[PDB]
Symmetry: C3
Subunit: 418 residues, 3 copies
Amino acid sequence: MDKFRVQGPTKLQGEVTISGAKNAALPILFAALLAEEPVEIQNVPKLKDVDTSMKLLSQLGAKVERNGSVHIDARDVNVFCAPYDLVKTMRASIWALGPLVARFGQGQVSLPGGATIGARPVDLHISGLEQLGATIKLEEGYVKASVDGRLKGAHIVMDKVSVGATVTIMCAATLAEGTTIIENAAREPEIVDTANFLITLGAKISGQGTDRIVIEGVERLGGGVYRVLPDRIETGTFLVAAAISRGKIICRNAQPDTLDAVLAKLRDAGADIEVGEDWISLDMHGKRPKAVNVRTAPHPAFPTDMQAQFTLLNLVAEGTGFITETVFENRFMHVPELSRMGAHAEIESNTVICHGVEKLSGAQVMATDLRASASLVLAGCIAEGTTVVDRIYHIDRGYERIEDKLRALGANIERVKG
Amino acid sequence: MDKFRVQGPTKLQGEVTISGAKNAALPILFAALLAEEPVEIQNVPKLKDVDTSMKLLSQLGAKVERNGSVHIDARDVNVFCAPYDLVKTMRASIWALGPLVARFGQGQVSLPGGATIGARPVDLHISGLEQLGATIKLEEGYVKASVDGRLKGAHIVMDKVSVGATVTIMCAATLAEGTTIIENAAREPEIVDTANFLITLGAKISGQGTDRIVIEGVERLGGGVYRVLPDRIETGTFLVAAAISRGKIICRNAQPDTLDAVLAKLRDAGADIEVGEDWISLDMHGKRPKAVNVRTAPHPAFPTDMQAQFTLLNLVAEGTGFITETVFENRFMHVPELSRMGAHAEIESNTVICHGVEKLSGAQVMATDLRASASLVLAGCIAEGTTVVDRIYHIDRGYERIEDKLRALGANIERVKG
Amino acid sequence: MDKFRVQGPTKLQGEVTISGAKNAALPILFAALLAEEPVEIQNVPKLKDVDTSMKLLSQLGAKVERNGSVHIDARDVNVFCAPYDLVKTMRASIWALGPLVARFGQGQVSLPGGATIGARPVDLHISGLEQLGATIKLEEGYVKASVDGRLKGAHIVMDKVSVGATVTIMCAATLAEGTTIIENAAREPEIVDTANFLITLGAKISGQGTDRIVIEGVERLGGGVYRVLPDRIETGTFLVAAAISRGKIICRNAQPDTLDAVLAKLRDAGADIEVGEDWISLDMHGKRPKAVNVRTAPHPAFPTDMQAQFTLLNLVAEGTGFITETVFENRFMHVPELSRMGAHAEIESNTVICHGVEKLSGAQVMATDLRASASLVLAGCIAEGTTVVDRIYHIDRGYERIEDKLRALGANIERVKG
Ligand SMILES: CC(=O)N[C@H]1[C@@H](OP(=O)(O)OP(=O)(O)OC[C@H]2O[C@@H](n3ccc(=O)[nH]c3=O)[C@H](O)[C@@H]2O)O[C@H](CO)[C@@H](O)[C@@H]1O[C@@](CF)(OP(=O)(O)O)C(=O)O
Ligand SMILES: CC(=O)N[C@H]1[C@@H](OP(=O)(O)OP(=O)(O)OC[C@H]2O[C@@H](n3ccc(=O)[nH]c3=O)[C@H](O)[C@@H]2O)O[C@H](CO)[C@@H](O)[C@@H]1O[C@@](CF)(OP(=O)(O)O)C(=O)O
Ligand SMILES: CC(=O)N[C@H]1[C@@H](OP(=O)(O)OP(=O)(O)OC[C@H]2O[C@@H](n3ccc(=O)[nH]c3=O)[C@H](O)[C@@H]2O)O[C@H](CO)[C@@H](O)[C@@H]1O[C@@](CF)(OP(=O)(O)O)C(=O)O
């Protein structure tokens, strides 16, 4: 079980180049199941899940290779069932379903198994596919969908915001008969990005970014070349790495406009943030962050996927910060691991109350999830002494080359056998 | 987003007239779907959800108007599907289902969407309707029920106490073939009230209030005139408004016997309670409440729907109070909002441990649910300075005219734009 | 409602003879539904649930009697539906399902109702039965399974570790056509034991204890005589009874090898543990335990079913102990009840942080579950003064004769009317 062994204190300062979004990359690799001429996707990070996804794409019979870009030729997809052995490692394989139903009239994906940050149902995928025509059955740990003939576009009001369900309905609606409207669409950048990929392939979508997306179905999608947006949560992570460590950094290959709410928040912890077109810099000027108060919620508010990292920021800032998590209901499993390093947090229902201390002591902690694991590694950069983060594999799902990137900022990290 | 801006400290004292029960009114409006001569329901409060319910009743083709009473002529109901656009605002629209199945042989209600105080499944509705004959399917975010011919009464043991499931089976059983027995029936006053409405219409029900209700089916229900009981949780709320503020008040238009367990509890916080037939008074005599210990559970024990308000009472009483919530599993979202106003609570599993402070400071808080929102407004009446309760819309679902009623007791409240 | 009234402090020291495992006994009584010559099961404890199970076995038409052993003749089973009235008291009746499907081609068990320590779905039973052939439907609060003809063995990878699902698939696979492989099988001793019972009856199973069990189906199972292993959680409980009370004890009729991880942990709280072949002794030598740190997880790690008892140990040990529960998600309901007796615990997500105090004061507490209830009784043995444990019925489900066994160690316990 690889662990990280980190020694602090250390001061994260320097520059980092930012990778493609994990969470754009993943939807778009599955969306390519609809494409009927070859596809090049540039700026794909190298993450555990991209690698599992590419394996599945080729178990369904697409021709796939990569490097800085992934290349997918999906013309001869012939299997329509994903094997459990690729699918259990990643929740993201539920997005093969809609592509296979829209374009092949069936699909069978396992029900994603292993929660961590909540129950995480896919009932809003199933529902929307159904509303567009499909017949879903659930049996033997699988979601079997099928439709005879094409789907029929529908007017789909989504009950709650869901980035992923929005993706499934958006993708599946591109090969449907007619016009789909998704009200209360998730507004996130990866949803926009994804829709723009679809549109390169020749989909007819408008109003992504907005709360109401519109797709009129076509009969066939082509191919083409799409570059993936920069990863705003890897970005937010490296901006927190330097605020909590009283440093300063520049983020290269970034998109500032996908981060407005973190940047304000970091303005509020006391940070000196500047931005240009494809870069952001933060300067703490030697100072310690000030406690902020956060509520997560969907884009464009403060992203849940930065909550664990702002948790640590607050627990070494000046003051009391409260952070309410509202999007997911078991996303404080980093807290007690941070407490073993010294921190002072009370949880009360969905809020973690946070009393900033000046320094944390290095400890042996456990990764419970992706963003927890990054948090715990940043925490040990700054702690006193030695942190060992057990189960560092989780970090590998969303931070390409991170020991290298944090060690370019001065960090002292080391990956240990097991 | 309307907020309340409250200034304290202030002393809630005076009198208040009590409204009809939200939670009797709601079941009875849906029960009227069975009535085949006109219905007058008197003492219906003016609550968000009554207004949504009346809109739906008339989208199914009943003739509906109101004022102090709601008037429903339900003879020409012809739609049997509730539209999502009325149904997503209110969980209470699941009670159209049983009326439409019993009397029309189908019905289609959306699955209620948006939790707050727990997961809140309706599996005990579905189960009992099924046991009485129906065929339920779940698809496209809907609960489709149907039966060919009448339902057949059954012997239905309910697995856990559920006020709402009890309602669905009780209503649906009135047009069934034969005799239904519900064991472990919910005993609440609104269940009794509801059954008595049904009985006015000519149902044949006995043993409501008891843990075993019996209904023998008839073929047709008529019409008539029913007045709704007084709202014991609006009542409990105004009795807490005055205990925590060291006041005194009289509740007009009340029913003492639906509150025995709160009244004892308030006797235990130190209150001087008197009661007559349709009124209750509490006198704190200038004094501060004493901490009590509560476990919620179904009627006739301490009602969950007073737990948030007794939370605040304890967090400004003398002493440590523990309150265990056992009925719903995400009903401490008022706690951290009360903590931002100064309070000292530890949560530990289902209990909130409560260390009474003498005064709370006014703050900016958020409503997370109905009874949370009332709690937060009472808390700012008593706090020092200014509270702003964001999302005050929630209060509107269960407290008719409340800014007026609390401002008649001296409160300084003001509704702000957004 | 019987309660226990306990007076401390008192010092639990002596010897105890250990009973058969509750959680081996239960699976094996249901597994006997497959046996087609008479079965004797020796060393069956006398627990509430064994008594409910025997009642059901004979409601399906087996011939059943007991004493130190239970005797089951299951040749003329003719009902295949379990009645709700036996089934709602026990989650363990879901294990009739697989036996009835494998051997009779149908079965109908109610969906288990009443949670306490989590949501506790049986989706991994259903899934595996399905994968082996069955057709499951869910309606009227029942799980109806059926297959026309035999089941067909399959290669079943289990998504998460589940002791019970492993049992259902293991049992049902013995009368199947061919070879079943269960990957990620639960490794627990009761699973091993159960498989060895099956094997006595003539099943063909190998690799229990391992993460991959293999069963090739036969056509008929016989009868025979199996003795049940010793109960390692009753064992762990009595070893904690004496560590927290600074005593010493000997466990007769034990199996040390099913407890390696508790024994180490108790070595770490400072205990002097010795073991022989069918016995374990612990000596605290007069001293108070030292705080340990626990994570639960499946066998062979630290068992969840000892977590509540190690909670109390830590909250009267020297130091801070952290205990993370990872197996079940509502298994800290003992904590606030222990807090009313004086303890200092913070919960933070899945961990209870534990600050050992030297003494607890006697109080009035409530049992919320099996292992909670034992914990609370051990806590009042050691507390100052009087504890009353309300709802002591829960203890009766897994600790045969416990007031007698703890009173043989010096305890002062008394069962009170209600
Ligand atoms: C791959 C990917 O797009 N993941 C991101 C994506 O994942 P997801 O699609 O599940 O979010 P979603 O909006 O659908 O969930 C929102 C809320 O809706 C519920 N939900 C979601 C789908 C549904 O059918 N029903 C439903 O009830 C969730 O259980 C949650 O309570 O949106 C969320 C929320 O903003 C991120 O927080 C994820 O990022 C993470 C995990 F959150 O990635 P991952 O899936 O790998 O685990 C992350 O990087 O931290
Ligand atoms: C309209 C109305 O009758 N609402 C009241 C009514 O609502 P409800 O019928 O859902 O209560 P119910 O007894 O059925 O729930 C009891 C417990 O049973 C579970 N439950 C309920 C139904 C079911 O099919 N399955 C099931 O598992 C719940 O999820 C809960 O954990 O009974 C509860 C409990 O005593 C009150 O606490 C509600 O009052 C509130 C909310 F609680 O109103 P609302 O629905 O508007 O939100 C309130 O005023 O505070
Ligand atoms: C009878 C019996 O075998 N019970 C023991 C048995 O029970 P169970 O089979 O449900 O454990 P299981 O491994 O299947 O559950 C493990 C985890 O998996 C989930 N789970 C389980 C089954 C499933 O189909 N799906 C699923 O999601 C659970 O909800 C839990 O989160 O394994 C557990 C876990 O190690 C013990 O902790 C139980 O012991 C207790 C309760 F835990 O007995 P009981 O059932 O009487 O309540 C106990 O003595 O304390």
